[PDB]
Amino acid sequence: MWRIWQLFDPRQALVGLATFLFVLALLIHFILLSTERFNWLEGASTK
Amino acid sequence: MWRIWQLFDPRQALVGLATFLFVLALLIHFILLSTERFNWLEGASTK
Amino acid sequence: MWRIWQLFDPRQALVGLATFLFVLALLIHFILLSTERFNWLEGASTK
Amino acid sequence: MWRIWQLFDPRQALVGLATFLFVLALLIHFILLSTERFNWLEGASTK
Amino acid sequence: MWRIWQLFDPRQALVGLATFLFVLALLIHFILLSTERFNWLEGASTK
Amino acid sequence: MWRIWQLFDPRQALVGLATFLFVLALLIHFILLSTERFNWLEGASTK
Amino acid sequence: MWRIWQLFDPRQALVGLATFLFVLALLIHFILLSTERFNWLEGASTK
Amino acid sequence: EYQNILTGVQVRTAPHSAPIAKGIFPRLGKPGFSYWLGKIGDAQIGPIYLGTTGVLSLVFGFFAIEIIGFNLLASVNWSPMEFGRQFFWLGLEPPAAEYGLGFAPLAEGGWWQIAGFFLTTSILLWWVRMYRRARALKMGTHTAWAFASAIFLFLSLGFIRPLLMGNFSESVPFGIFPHLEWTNSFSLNYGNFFYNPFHMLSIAFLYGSALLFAMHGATILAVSRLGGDREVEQITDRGTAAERAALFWRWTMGFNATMESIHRWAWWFAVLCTFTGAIGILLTGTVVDNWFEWGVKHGLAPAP
Amino acid sequence: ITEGEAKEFHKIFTSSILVFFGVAAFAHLLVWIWRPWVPGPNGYS
Amino acid sequence: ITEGEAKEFHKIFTSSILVFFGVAAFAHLLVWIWRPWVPGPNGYS
Amino acid sequence: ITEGEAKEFHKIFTSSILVFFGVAAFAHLLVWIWRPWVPGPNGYS
Amino acid sequence: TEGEAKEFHKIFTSSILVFFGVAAFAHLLVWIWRPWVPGPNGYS
Amino acid sequence: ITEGEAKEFHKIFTSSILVFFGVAAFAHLLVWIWRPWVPGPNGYS
Amino acid sequence: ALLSFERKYRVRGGTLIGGDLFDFWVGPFYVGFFGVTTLLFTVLGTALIVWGAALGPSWTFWQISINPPDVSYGLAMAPMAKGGLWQIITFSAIGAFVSWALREVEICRKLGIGYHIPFAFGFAILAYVSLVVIRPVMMGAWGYGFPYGFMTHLDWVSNTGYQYANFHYNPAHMLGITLFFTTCLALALHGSLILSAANPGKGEVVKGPEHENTYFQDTIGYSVGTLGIHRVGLILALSAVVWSIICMILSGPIYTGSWPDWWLWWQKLPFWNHG
Amino acid sequence: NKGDITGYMDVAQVVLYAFWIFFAGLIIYLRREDRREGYPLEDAISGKINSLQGLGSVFSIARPKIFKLKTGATYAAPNFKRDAVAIKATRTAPTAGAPFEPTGNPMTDAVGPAAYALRDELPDLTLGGQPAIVPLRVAPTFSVAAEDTDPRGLPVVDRKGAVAGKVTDLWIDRASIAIRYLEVELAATPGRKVLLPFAATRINAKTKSKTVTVQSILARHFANVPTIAKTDSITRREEDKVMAYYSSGYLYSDRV
């Protein structure tokens, strides 16, 4: 699977991967913040 | 079936399929979060 | 009926067919979800 | 009759025919879905 | 009459005639669907 | 009263005349449909 | 009074006269239809 | 004192166009010429390309338009006079709340749904047509994505927000005055749509698009005596028209664009005008019930 | 256009006038037999 | 274009007229037998 | 485009005409068996 | 070309049949789960 | 594309599609074990 | 501090007023006499706006507002505490806008280009003047101008729009909205066409004017032309502003009623006034 | 409540701040695209590469994008090809902000509004690889449309009314169908021929007679209009030179 970089530029692919992962992580974090159970800033009760 | 890549370039096919799969996965996940039974973050009772 | 490809171009015909089939599948799935009997995500009681 | 294709290009005739038939069939299915009698998914009673 | 078709090109004439007849037929079907008596999709009664 | 065609070319004259006649007929039919007396589709007692 | 026809060619003059007279006839008929006394279709009584 | 606002002397030659592969469909339209259009711009008309995607889009769009017009005419009992009277007030209304996202009865919003589906399909097929026409001429697809922004706003108004609310009841009708009344009632139901910040962003970008396309139009018309109207050629080989266009704005404003990058600004202001608008529409009702109370909470209002 | 062709076209066009106007007149006769469209002094009754 | 190459077109056209009008009249006859579309003095009841 | 190119296309085209019409007619007969779409005098049963 | 159309059709028909077989299996399973043709009294 | 590299891409693309489908199938089986998504005749519970 | 081609057009002359006194540059900016005057008016107006913010209760940038005098003052000058500050800021803003346009005129003369840009800016200045001077004068009070505030001038827009109970029904407003939307659409199309011609893809040599014409001939059926597009765009924006000015002059100075029922005239034309 | 994320922060505010971040990035991108011509900046007097610029310099200038031509040619943007510091003018004051006194006739010295970009000596190309700006003599197919005054043989006069010359030929752009130039034979020198841009003309079709007037330069200024080589195909540099010369009239049309 090392030939993928013969198709995709390592610099461009790595930058795009980094940005995509950052946006995905940020969105997942904000989604967890929105929920009552997994918001770690208010800290609501499980019950 | 190897001849389909004769018609379609591996690189454009890869990027298009990657974006399609990610968008479809996001859409299905958002649909599941929209349903009461399958929202794993609110965790509504099966009852 | 093998001459159907002697009129149109395999590559464009294939991409058009794939796009049309996917859009039709999405439409039928969305219509089924919009119905109470066949919405497999919401709790669907026959009676 | 046999020379209907000497005035119309068979590719254009086929494309126009397929487009019109697809749109008409979609419209007919949508209209039946918008009925208390022929909506096969809602399945309302005849009586 | 073997000399009256030298006034219009048969291709465009047939296409225009087909489009016009289809529009008129669609309109007549729509008008029937609007009227209670001739709306065949609904179970309206004569008396 | 035959010398008209020296000026008005039959081709475009017939097309314009046919379109005008169809539009006029459609207009009269719609006007008749609107009126409660001459609507042959809805049906209403004269007396 | 015949001298009109070396400034106004009969083609444009007659097509303009036809359009003007047809529009005026439509106007007068519609204006009559808007009045109760002269609406021959609704046929409101004189008294 | 000439201004290049109107073309006093016109030129007319044998119509010609860039070469495309023949394809299933040929170019159609027997090109002609017009005088006022040549006074304001080019004089040639057509020919229009009608491909498979073009036929598909035209058929779907014509079906939607015929459905809408038939319903509008039927709403006034097929009276041409009364159709003329109420044409602006006529509208194909969306289905009520109780029907959800499923098919309503034809009289109760089924026709609205069918027309909206056909219109959406024709608009998306037209987007595909713009993409394919740009690709066929060996050009870029910037127009397709600029159009995709507008389609995003359109689908947010008509389909996406109904999906989120699970309801077509608050979608926009097919009418002249009815869709303005939808705009007014949508703003009223959700508290002073001025207090929607993405509405403020969209208005900022609409104002900026008008401002930019007046600035750029006046700049190109001001350097049109220097070959400045030939923008792509000044992009590939910078002439003194582009230099003076840049220096005018650099001296009056402190900064400047390129003949190429000014159109990037033009593209992005227009795109953002509808992107922020679609976001603001998707946010109302779903996340923010009342935009005035959101503005009060976040310091946009003096907190009555 | 040659006057003979114009004369022939006029003849066939007058034939079409005859058939169309006859059809329309028969249609109007049938409609009047069904329901007249000239109301009386006291209206439609 | 050529008269000799279009007379057969007219033959096909008139055959299509015949068949289409026959199908249309057949359909209209069935619709009339199902429900007539000319109301009488009392309407339709 | 030629008199020969048109012959095979017409053969296959009319084969498809018959196949499509037969499939549609069978589907319509099935739907009519399920629920008829021409109402009676008193409406649908 | 038209020579390659033979092999293209040979593989295209096999793809058509396999896709249709998967779709038909899905439809049969769905019909077992919930048939979509109601009876005279609606659904029950 | 060159047939020699087309064969290699098809081989390892087929392997990768097998991997993705297998992981997705495992995920679906886990979700089904957790909560099935095909309701019974009387709803879910 | 200069572009690669800047130290070739930095000649003197082209100034309407000031001679050689202010014919110089500061950084990238050209100053001139009218740059000095626009600094004079901008500094004073901004200082007065900040002073009104200090007199205000917020310092919240979006709640800072400078209100015009109450309508009970009519067209009279108002005390600075209550209404007069808005008037002075209005006059300073008008002076600064005029100085800006005139400085643009001097720059146009210096570069030997047309005066299209200051002429186009004149329409924005006219729209502002119609909103704060012309319409309040016709209506008879300075309190019909809009407050100088981020969100409060939106409150003014909403209040005046609903004063006629639906301001969409203003036909000049409909036409101005149509022109603004068409300007945005035309700008999108123009920027997109230029970018696509200049950036056609991998390989894909730069396309010429013929390709740009062909694109919109194929997609729409007509192509305006690489020169006529800037014409129609400038005319579209200026006409949108003109019709907005017209719709605001029509509301209050001319029409003082419900715009929705203005359209009953249409309902009662003699060829469908069924009554 | 319904739409909040953490107490005071809600979804709409988060999406707003996401837009603000995206718009900051987009402004950076657009400014990078803007800085593709005339950059980097030079000193106003000495011309060394200097400017008051911060940590954004590394992000200020983009890598040169490559434009491909339909001739094998290529343009690089930015190409760091700058102008010479020493122009035919002198600083009024040595303060780096002062303007320039021309040191000669600025019409023919290309100083100020007469200055023209140092382009390349190739005519604009059509879709067929031929010159776009051509005289109507060598384009038989192209013709002047009717309902418009034909600007052939009309006297060419300035604002003062003096007849500068006579128009003989029209030069037109093939890529965009419109008149670009009028070929003018001098009434003072038959052996001299000049090109006058069509954008610099008034039609003047509504007067006692038909004439072409120019409001920029005077009649004598037609004796120093820059010349062209081929007389049937004009390069970009030559046309830019001629347009710059004609546009220089308005500033100093009456001496300096």
Ligand code: 07D
């Ligand atoms: C009482 C009303 C209330 C009041 C407070 C107020 C006032 C103001 N507003 Mg607002 N507005 C209110 C409500 C409100 N407002 C908007 C929108 C905007 C945006 C639109 C941008 C655009 O181009 O749209 C327009 C673009 C669209 C709709 C998207 C593209 C459309 C397409 C591709 C259609 C293709 C069509 C065919 C192919 C043709 C065939 C089809 C048929 C025949 C059926 C723009 C910025 C804008 C401007 C201002 C200003 C200047 C003011 C001033 C001065 O007061 N408003 C939309 C939006 O984006 O909101 C976030 C939206 O949905 C919505 C609502 C509900």
Ligand SMILES: CCc1c(C)c2cc3nc(cc4[nH]c(c(CCC(=O)OC/C=C(\C)CC/C=C(\C)CC/C=C(\C)CCC=C(C)C)c4C)c4c5nc(cc1[nH]2)C(C)=C5C(=O)[C@@H]4C(=O)OC)C(C)=C3C(C)=O
């Ligand atoms: C940046 C955001 C910007 C905003 C401010 C903005 C707003 C609005 N943009 C609006 C309308 C359209 N926009 C468009 C097109 C789509 C055509 C379509 O869908 O046809 C598909 C539909 C249909 C086929 C349905 C009917 C058909 C009719 C009336 C003909 C029926 C009769 C027939 C077929 C028979 C006779 C003829 C024969 C040949 C047999 C229309 C004219 C397009 C683009 N917007 C862009 C952007 C913007 N649009 C860009 C970049 C564009 C394109 O690329 C594309 C285009 O073609 O532009 C030239 C509206 C109503 C707006 C408002 C204000 O509400």
Ligand SMILES: COC(C)(C)C\C=C/C(C)=C/C=C/C(C)=C/C=C/C(C)=C/C=C\C=C(C)\C=C\C=C(C)\C=C\C=C(C)\C=C\CC(C)(C)OC
């Ligand atoms: C050619 O025409 C002749 C006959 C002359 C006349 C014909 C017609 C006429 C006169 C038409 C006039 C039309 C008018 C006045 C139209 C006005 C239209 C306006 C202003 C529309 C404005 C906005 C409407 C919008 C944005 C609606 C958007 C709706 C959408 C996107 C809905 C999509 C819905 C979908 C996809 C539904 C999905 C649900 C189901 C399950 C049904 O999908 C299958």
Ligand SMILES: CCCCCCCCCCCCO[C@@H]1O[C@H](CO)[C@@H](O[C@H]2O[C@H](CO)[C@@H](O)[C@H](O)[C@H]2O)[C@H](O)[C@H]1O
């Ligand atoms: C199903 C619900 C309703 C939605 C409608 C779904 C069907 C319509 C969209 C199908 C997808 C269309 O996708 C597009 O199809 C057409 C053929 O039709 C193909 O395009 C074809 O026509 C173009 C027209 O310019 C020609 O150049 C050429 O004949 C061929 O390329 C494209 O390669 C494909 O991208």
Ligand SMILES: CCCCCCCCCCCCO[C@@H]1O[C@H](CO)[C@@H](O[C@H]2O[C@H](CO)[C@@H](O)[C@H](O)[C@H]2O)[C@H](O)[C@H]1O
């Ligand atoms: C091939 C592709 C195109 C398919 C086209 C198909 C067209 C089909 C047209 C069907 C017409 C049927 O015509 C119809 O026949 C049935 C009997 O069978 C009659 O029966 C009808 O009325 C009776 C009396 O109440 C009812 O009991 C009955 O349920 C109802 O169907 C109708 O009075 C007659 O109008």
Ligand SMILES: CCCCCCCCCCCCO[C@@H]1O[C@H](CO)[C@@H](O[C@H]2O[C@H](CO)[C@@H](O)[C@H](O)[C@H]2O)[C@H](O)[C@H]1O
């Ligand atoms: C590519 C995919 C192709 C899909 C093809 C689908 C073909 C559909 C086959 C229909 C078979 C009919 O099968 C028969 O239909 C009748 C209605 O007429 C239904 O009737 C039955 O179900 C209904 C509703 O559940 C109830 O009232 C009752 O249980 C019974 O009447 C049953 O479903 C079955 O007895």
Ligand SMILES: CCCCCCCCCCCCO[C@@H]1O[C@H](CO)[C@@H](O[C@H]2O[C@H](CO)[C@@H](O)[C@H](O)[C@H]2O)[C@H](O)[C@H]1O
């Ligand atoms: C490869 C990755 C993606 C994989 C996607 C494929 C997923 C396929 C899921 C559906 C497969 C069929 O799954 C089968 O459905 C039937 C209904 O017909 C279910 O039905 C059975 O269980 C339900 C549970 O409540 C009972 O109510 C019902 O009486 C009983 O018949 C079975 O529990 C299930 O085993």
Ligand SMILES: [Fe+3]
């Ligand atoms: Fe431009």
